[PDB]
Swiss-Prot record:
Family: Belongs to the tenascin family.
Protein name in the entry: Tenascin
Taxonomic placement: Eukaryota, Metazoa, Chordata, Craniata, Vertebrata
This protein's encoding gene: TNC
Subunit structure comment from the entry: Homohexamer; disulfide-linked. A homotrimer may be formed in the triple coiled-coil region and may be stabilized by disulfide rings at both ends. Two of such half-hexabrachions may be disulfide linked within the central globule. Interacts with CSPG4. Interacts (via the 3rd fibronectin type-III domain) with integrin ITGA9:ITGB1.
UniProt superkingdom: Eukaryota
Medical condition linked: Deafness, autosomal dominant, 56: A form of non-syndromic sensorineural hearing loss. Sensorineural deafness results from damage to the neural receptors of the inner ear, the nerve pathways to the brain, or the area of the brain that receives sound information. DFNA56 is characterized by progressive hearing impairment with postlingual onset.
Amino acid sequence: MRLDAPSQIEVKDVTDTTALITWMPPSQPVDGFELTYGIKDVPGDRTTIDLTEDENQYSIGNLKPDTEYEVSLISRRGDMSSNPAKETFTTGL
Protein backbone atom coordinates (compact mmCIF):
# COMPACT_ATOMS: atom_id res chain seq x y z
CA MET A 1 0.00 0.00 0.00
CA ARG A 2 1.49 3.34 -0.89
CA LEU A 3 2.09 6.13 1.61
CA ASP A 4 2.24 9.37 -0.36
CA ALA A 5 2.87 12.73 1.25
CA PRO A 6 0.06 15.32 1.39
CA SER A 7 -0.09 17.73 -1.55
CA GLN A 8 -1.08 21.31 -2.26
CA ILE A 9 0.37 22.66 0.98
CA GLU A 10 -0.90 26.22 1.30
CA VAL A 11 -0.30 28.94 3.88
CA LYS A 12 -3.31 31.23 4.40
CA ASP A 13 -4.46 34.05 6.70
CA VAL A 14 -0.91 35.03 7.50
CA THR A 15 -0.74 37.68 10.21
CA ASP A 16 2.29 38.87 12.17
CA THR A 17 2.12 35.98 14.62
CA THR A 18 -0.24 33.41 13.13
CA ALA A 19 -0.82 31.46 9.92
CA LEU A 20 -3.20 28.78 8.69
CA ILE A 21 -1.60 25.77 7.04
CA THR A 22 -3.79 23.67 4.75
CA TRP A 23 -3.21 20.56 2.65
CA MET A 24 -4.77 17.81 0.58
CA PRO A 25 -4.47 14.35 2.15
CA PRO A 26 -2.96 11.39 0.21
CA SER A 27 -5.16 9.01 -1.80
CA GLN A 28 -4.65 6.15 0.68
CA PRO A 29 -5.72 5.78 4.30
CA VAL A 30 -3.37 7.13 6.97
CA ASP A 31 -3.48 7.29 10.76
CA GLY A 32 -2.72 10.99 10.69
CA PHE A 33 -0.13 13.63 9.85
CA GLU A 34 2.84 15.33 11.44
CA LEU A 35 3.33 19.04 10.79
CA THR A 36 6.72 20.53 11.62
CA TYR A 37 7.26 24.28 11.66
CA GLY A 38 9.98 26.70 12.70
CA ILE A 39 12.18 29.59 11.63
CA LYS A 40 13.68 28.41 8.34
CA ASP A 41 17.25 29.56 9.04
CA VAL A 42 17.17 28.23 12.59
CA PRO A 43 17.46 24.41 12.49
CA GLY A 44 17.09 24.34 16.28
CA ASP A 45 13.63 25.91 16.13
CA ARG A 46 11.39 23.04 15.10
CA THR A 47 8.03 22.13 16.63
CA THR A 48 6.15 19.04 15.49
CA ILE A 49 2.37 18.93 15.76
CA ASP A 50 0.39 15.66 15.77
CA LEU A 51 -2.79 15.60 13.63
CA THR A 52 -5.45 12.92 13.07
CA GLU A 53 -6.28 11.77 9.53
CA ASP A 54 -9.48 13.82 9.37
CA GLU A 55 -7.49 17.02 9.99
CA ASN A 56 -6.48 18.80 6.78
CA GLN A 57 -5.45 22.16 8.24
CA TYR A 58 -3.80 23.65 11.33
CA SER A 59 -3.48 27.21 12.62
CA ILE A 60 -0.03 27.96 14.01
CA GLY A 61 0.36 30.72 16.57
CA ASN A 62 2.96 32.65 18.55
CA LEU A 63 5.12 33.20 15.48
CA LYS A 64 7.79 35.89 15.10
CA PRO A 65 6.71 38.95 13.07
CA ASP A 66 8.38 39.55 9.70
CA THR A 67 10.20 36.21 9.81
CA GLU A 68 10.55 33.44 7.23
CA TYR A 69 9.19 30.08 8.35
CA GLU A 70 9.26 26.63 6.82
CA VAL A 71 6.48 24.10 7.28
CA SER A 72 6.82 20.36 6.67
CA LEU A 73 4.01 17.79 6.45
CA ILE A 74 4.26 14.03 6.66
CA SER A 75 1.54 11.40 6.29
CA ARG A 76 1.64 8.77 9.02
CA ARG A 77 0.65 5.11 9.09
CA GLY A 78 1.83 2.76 11.83
CA ASP A 79 5.46 3.65 12.56
CA MET A 80 5.73 4.50 8.86
CA SER A 81 6.05 7.99 7.40
CA SER A 82 5.79 9.45 3.91
CA ASN A 83 8.45 11.81 2.57
CA PRO A 84 7.86 15.36 3.77
CA ALA A 85 5.98 17.96 1.71
CA LYS A 86 7.28 21.47 2.41
CA GLU A 87 6.38 25.15 1.99
CA THR A 88 7.93 28.44 3.07
CA PHE A 89 6.18 31.67 4.11
CA THR A 90 6.96 35.00 5.79
CA THR A 91 4.84 36.41 8.64
CA GLY A 92 3.67 40.02 8.33
CA LEU A 93 4.77 43.07 10.38
